[PDB]
Each structure stands twice: as structure tokens, then as C-alpha cells.
Amino acid sequence: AGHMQVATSTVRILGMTCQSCVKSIEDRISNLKGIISMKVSLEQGSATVKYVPSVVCLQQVCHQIGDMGFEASIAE
């Protein structure tokens, strides 16, 4: 992973039912072990992600919500 330890990202959340996808991703990501901390901000329309990329990859996080049928995109 490019990041030395903790990678930060703000992932935009786009969907008609934001709460539904937040619920969907929150459960799946919490199912992943090695999680540090994250915050989904409705006001921002994006979530602040802090994880060790080697332990947990951001692609899976995007995968979890994307597979649900909602669009999310990584940004710093």
C-alpha cells in the first residue's frame, strides 16, 4: 500500500436511499476485522475513512456499497 500506515479518504455517497446504503456498508465493514475508525457524514455527503490499507483495502469498502447498487467514489 502506498500509505505508510493509515490511509484517509472521503468517499462520496450517491444514492436515493443514503441511510440504506450506509447501513449496508457499515455492517459489512464492521464485519471486516482490523478496523480502526470511520465516520459517515450525511452533511458532507461523504464518509471519513481511516484504516490501514494493508489490513483493510479501500477497494473492498467501495465494493461493499457499490455491489449494493449505490455509487461511491474514493477521494482524499
Curated annotation (Swiss-Prot):
Localization, UniProt: Golgi apparatus, trans-Golgi network membrane; Late endosome
Post-translational modification note: Isoform 1 may be proteolytically cleaved at the N-terminus to produce the WND/140 kDa form.
Sequence ranges assigned to domain HMA in this UniProt record: 7-73
Tissue-specificity statement: Most abundant in liver and kidney and also found in brain. Isoform 2 is expressed in brain but not in liver. The cleaved form WND/140 kDa is found in liver cell lines and other tissues.
Signal peptide (UniProt feature, chain positions): none
Binding-site residues for Cu(+) 1, renumbered to this chain: C18, C21
Subunit annotation: Monomer. Interacts with COMMD1/MURR1. Interacts with DCTN4, in a copper-dependent manner. Interacts with ATOX1. Interacts (via C-terminus) with ZBTB16/PLZF.
Domain statement: Each HMA domain can bind a copper ion, they are tightly packed and closely interact with each other. Wild-type ATP7B can usually be loaded with an average 5.5 copper atoms per molecule.
Family per record: Belongs to the cation transport ATPase (P-type) (TC 3.A.3) family. Type IB subfamily.
Pathology linked to this chain's protein: Wilson disease: An autosomal recessive disorder of copper metabolism in which copper cannot be incorporated into ceruloplasmin in liver, and cannot be excreted from the liver into the bile. Copper accumulates in the liver and subsequently in the brain and kidney. The disease is characterized by neurologic manifestations and signs of cirrhosis.
Function noted in UniProt: Copper ion transmembrane transporter involved in the export of copper out of the cells. It is involved in copper homeostasis in the liver, where it ensures the efflux of copper from hepatocytes into the bile in response to copper overload.
Name by which UniProt lists this protein: Copper-transporting ATPase 2
Part of the full-length chain shown: 56 to 127 of 1465
